[PDB]
């Protein structure tokens, strides 16, 4: 049989097709799923990334500081914690199904608070004030396909591996028809909810409609970017089912960020270390060296980050970058390689904060060649005369030619005109483009300085500035030649 095409790279999962609704004779024949071995969850890759170390690696004084400020390793989230814990505890205790909506900007401690609520609920269930529950965590951005959530949650409930439609009907039958005394409470965290939004909103409606079912015993904690995500991207059914009591995670104030950073650096700030002067390795309790990071530097970093975002990740990274800058200067001045008072100062914090604020666009255009600068200058002249914000490339060609032939008494132009139009050579004819014309055009397109229209006619194709005009002029005002003309 001769095949019209071949699919020779098919990788099919071993997932079954029969849903949960057809594996028992009736509703009254379903056994107690709590007393089942595969149901409700009743790591093999960790050995593969281990090797033998044959060098004693030198950890300086700032190494413990930089390891301390990592996001992987709650003074300011106590009302959000109380609200989420009260709602989840009341839904677990009363065998109720509910939705808890949480939204906020990045890094304001939403996932951390939800996980701490879940850990405290598990601690409460361990000592038997609430019935036992299953915890499922589904991130919408960690799914290859959005329907994989259907494959994930059911696999966490029954231990079976099914396809997504069969998993969806299995979850529907489990939430609607299975009695509450026969099942267990399930708390599901939906993280990055905007990634679970499809064109038809099947998954959103299903997940928030299962919470309206009597027998479901399902608690859905939905974590999102904004308050008005259902009112913008979801229908009125899903917006009605999510509810009206929505939990805001506002950005941190500077006191809260300062308290977070001080609670990180609680045991190592204003402390003493044993440091070997020949190598630089530091041991917490040969010179006794006193480590401090100043509270004024942390304070103003907290004030700047809190004014910008309120992001705890940004504040921790600014402090870690300041520690990295101080450690780089320390290892430079002490001659320390890789195998009395050390202070992370305020100037390091201000160097860390300004490094993402300095703009390399003007610095990049300042160090370009003369022909790229001449291109930019001629484009600025065309934008000055005809005022279009989009100039044809042939107009730029004729404006470059005009600027060369008018300032023909300028000494630099007299020295460089043969370079632009003959590459400094006899036996090379007078060219219609300058030397490195498409080179600087593609260079400015690669940098994102310009936008070029997709046309095959080189003259009437238009080119637009992608950056602001005053920084381009500023960069043109630094040069000694283009200032004169």
């Amino acid at each position: 049989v001769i095949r019209k095409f071949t699919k020779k790279n098919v990788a099919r999962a071993k997932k079954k097709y029969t849903p949960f609704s057809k594996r028992f004779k009736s509703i009254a024949a379903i056994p107690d799923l709590t007393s089942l071995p595969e149901f409700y969850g009743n790591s093999r890759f960790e050995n593969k990334l281990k090797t033998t170390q044959k060098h004693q690696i030198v950890e300086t004084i700032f190494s413990k500081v930089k390891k301390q400020l990592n996001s992987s390793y709650l003074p300011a989230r106590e009302n959000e914690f109380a609200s989420i814990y009260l709602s989840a505890y009341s839904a677990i205790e009363s065998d109720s199904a509910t939705t808890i909506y949480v939204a906020g900007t990045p890094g304001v401690g939403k996932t951390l608070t939800v996980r701490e609520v879940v850990k405290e609920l598990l601690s409460s269930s361990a000592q038997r004030e609430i019935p036992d529950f299953l915890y499922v965590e589904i991130n919408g951005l960690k799914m290859v396909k959005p329907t994989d959530c259907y494959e994930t949650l059911w696999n966490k409930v029954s231990g079976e591996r099914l396809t997504w439609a069969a998993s969806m009907e299995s979850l529907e039958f489990y939430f609607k028809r299975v009695p509450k005394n026969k099942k267990k409470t399930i708390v599901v965290l939906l993280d990055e909810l905007d990634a679970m939004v499809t064109k038809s909103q099947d998954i959103m409606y299903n997940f928030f409609n299962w919470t309206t079912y009597e027998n479901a015993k399902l608690i859905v904690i939905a974590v999102a970017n904004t308050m008005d995500l259902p009112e913008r991207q979801l229908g009125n059914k899903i917006t009605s089912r999510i509810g009206f009591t929505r939990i805001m995670f506002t950005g941190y104030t500077h006191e809260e960020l300062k308290n977070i950073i001080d609670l990180r650096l609680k045991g190592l700030n204003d402390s003493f270390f044993y440091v070997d002067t020949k190598t630089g390795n530091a041991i917490l309790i040969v010179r006794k060296v006193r480590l401090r990071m100043s509270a004024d530097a942390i304070e103003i970093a907290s004030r700047k980050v809190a004014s910008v975002s309120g992001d705890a990740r940004r504040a921790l990274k600014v402090c870690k970058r300041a520690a990295e800058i101080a450690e780089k200067h320390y290892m430079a001045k002490h001659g320390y390689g890789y195998d009395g008072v050390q202070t992370v100062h305020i100037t390091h914090v201000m160097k860390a904060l300004n490094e993402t604020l300095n703009s390399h666009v003007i610095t990049f255009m300042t160090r370009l060649s003369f022909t790229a600068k001449l291109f930019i200058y001629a484009l600025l002249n065309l934008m000055k005369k005809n005022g279009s914000q989009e100039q044809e490339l042939g107009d730029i060609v004729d404006e470059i030619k005009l600027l060369i032939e008018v300032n023909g008494s300028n000494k630099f132009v007299m020295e460089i005109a043969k370079t632009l139009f003959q590459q400094g050579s006899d036996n090379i004819s007078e060219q219609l483009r300058i030397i490195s014309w498409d080179f600087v055009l593609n260079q400015l397109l690669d940098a994102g300085i310009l936008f070029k229209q997709t046309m095959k006619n080189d003259r009437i194709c238009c080119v637009k500035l992608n950056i602001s005009v005053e920084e381009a002029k500023r960069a043109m005002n630094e040069d000694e030649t283009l200032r004169n003309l």
Binding site: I2, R3, K4, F5, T6
Partner: protein, 544 residues
């Protein structure tokens, strides 16, 4: 409701020939059955020869295509006037596989699809005669390594006038790349329906220089030299020889309608002859008298309607100036040798004078009137044989009772009607359609479509719809309309709407608007807006 659906199948209930009784219902059923059987024995006798002519022209076209095809470049054959219906069969050359690849403009949206379809067809044919490959021109490269034999590809391009010529051009330069392989022979067949000057101006000059190295024109059609046509006409004449006559107006109508169709004139000729035979065996009660078996039941109605004949009246006027049923039987044994005369003249033109480009239908026309000499004067080779080839058209009494004629306009109403003009004359006149026999309203009030078409015709190219409504409203009697709408007292809402003083302004407006949307559905009017309905413009003018 199945009328509100797209397609529904119904099975009728059930509790046998379509021929009717003639002679105002006086004809017997045995004459009807005999006329049915005689129509079928002439119809089958004609269409068997038509089938043998169609099989012969297909076989001869296959033979000449094979002869041109088999006698580092393409072998190009331009079939001019080709309708892309030929089956091109290829011989089994030893140690080499010959593959036919056919390409449709629907199958050619771009060059990539052309190559992929061609290479799938090639691989399917090669596997069907003798692991899979990529459907790509590298299969032509490795054809001997994968199949052992070498290759001969014949490309047949169906309907080249409708293809995108840039895509075809790029496919030709793409196929040109297979010339560097030693085991590859490529032939191209272009089915051209217009002429070669249209296709030489759409291809590039390098493509023309590529195709010029080995190319053959072949002008094969139905009008090529009139051979196939004249055979169908001679088959029809041999079917009706000794029984039926062809009128000169019928033959000239055949020539006129066959002049207006060029690509498919043969089956048009068969269609007109078929409908003429159907008309004769449906109309004439004397159709049973074309054979001498059925002359034993001529009744008084037959003798009544054979006495209303111009030829018989001329004959008896000549006899009373000079000086019945047995005498009518006496006019059946005669030969009427005009068909044998026409086939003898055709044979004398064909195999004595070597003249093939003659139209036997127009020759039969000139033989029917008697202007054969003016038709034979054109060749300048029958100057000394014209007297023997000429014979006078004989006049036979009761010829028009056995005659395919065209005097009533039937054959130009069923096969080539003036469709738009028929719609216009039905809409404008309207008393020629509906019978003149709501008893008072039908004699004073026109139908709404016919009444609207008058003001449609007498207005201008752009019509304001409200003034057109007013001009419709002035043509309607309001008192008689209100009297007719009060005729039925069993409808309460009609009576409560009629006594309202603006009832006529409702009634005339809604009849006007249902006629306006009827006109829009027929395509007479259109709207010069999409969001507005305030002005119409008309698209249909009478008489064109």
């Amino acid at each position: 409701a199945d009328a509100q659906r797209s397609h529904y199948t119904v099975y009728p209930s059930l509790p046998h020939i379509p021929f009717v009784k003639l002679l105002s219902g006086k004809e017997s059923e045995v004459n009807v059955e005999k006329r049915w059987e005689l129509y079928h024995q002439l119809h089958s006798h004609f269409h068997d020869q038509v089938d043998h002519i169609i099989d012969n022209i297909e076989a001869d076209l296959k033979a000449e295509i094979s002869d041109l095809l088999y006698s580092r470049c393409f072998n190009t054959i331009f079939l001019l006037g080709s309708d892309s219906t030929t089956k091109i069969e290829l011989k089994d050359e030893s140690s080499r596989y010959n593959v036919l690849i056919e390409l449709t403009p629907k199958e050619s949206p771009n060059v990539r699809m052309m190559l992929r379809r061609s290479m799938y067809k090639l691989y399917s044919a090669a596997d069907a005669e003798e692991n899979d490959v990529s459907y790509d021109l590298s299969l032509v490269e490795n054809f001997k390594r994968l199949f052992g034999k070498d290759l001969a590809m014949v490309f047949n391009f169906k309907d080249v006038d409708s293809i995108n010529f840039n895509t075809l051009d790029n496919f030709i330069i793409l196929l040109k790349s297979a010339f560097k392989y030693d085991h590859v022979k490529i032939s191209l067949i272009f089915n051209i329906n217009t002429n070669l000057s249209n296709i030489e101006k759409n291809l590039r000059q390098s493509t023309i220089r590529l195709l010029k190295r080995n190319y053959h024109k072949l002008d094969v059609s139905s009008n090529k030299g009139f051979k196939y046509g004249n055979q169908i006409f001679q088959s029809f004449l041999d079917t009706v020889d000794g029984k039926l006559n062809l009128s000169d107006r019928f033959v000239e109508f055949i020539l006129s309608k066959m002049a207006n169709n060029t690509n498919h004139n043969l089956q048009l000729l068969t269609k007109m002859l078929d409908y003429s035979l159907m008309s004769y065996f449906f109309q004439n009660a004397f159709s049973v008298f074309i054979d001498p078996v059925n002359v034993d039941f001529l009744n008084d109605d037959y003798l009544k309607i054979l006495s209303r004949c111009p030829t018989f009246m001329f004959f008896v006027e000549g006899l009373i100036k000079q000086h019945l049923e047995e005498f009518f039987v006496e006019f059946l044994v005669r030969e009427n040798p005009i068909n044998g005369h026409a086939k003898f003249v055709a044979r004398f033109l064909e195999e004595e004078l070597n003249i093939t480009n003659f139209n036997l239908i127009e020759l039969y026309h000139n033989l029917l009137i008697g202007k054969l000499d003016s038709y034979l004067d054109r060749w300048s080779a029958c100057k000394e044989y014209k007297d023997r080839l000429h014979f006078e058209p004989i006049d036979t009494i009761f010829q028009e009772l056995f005659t395919l004629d065209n005097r009533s306009g039937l054959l130009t109403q069923s096969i080539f009607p003036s469709y738009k003009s028929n719609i216009e004359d039905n809409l404008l006149s309207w008393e020629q359609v509906l019978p003149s026999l709501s008893g008072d309203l039908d004699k004073i009030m026109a139908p709404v479509l016919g009444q609207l078409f008058k003001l449609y015709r007498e207005a201008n190219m752009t019509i304001n719809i409200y003034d057109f409504y007013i001009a419709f409203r002035e043509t309607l009697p309001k008192e008689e309309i209100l009297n007719f709408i009060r005729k039925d007292p069993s409808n309460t809402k009609l009576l409560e709407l009629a006594e309202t003083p603006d009832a006529f302004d409702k009634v005339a407006l809604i009849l006007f608007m249902q006629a306006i949307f009827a006109f829009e559905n027929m395509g007479l009017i259109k709207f010069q807006s999409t969001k507005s309905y305030d002005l119409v413009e008309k698209c249909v003018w009478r008489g064109i």
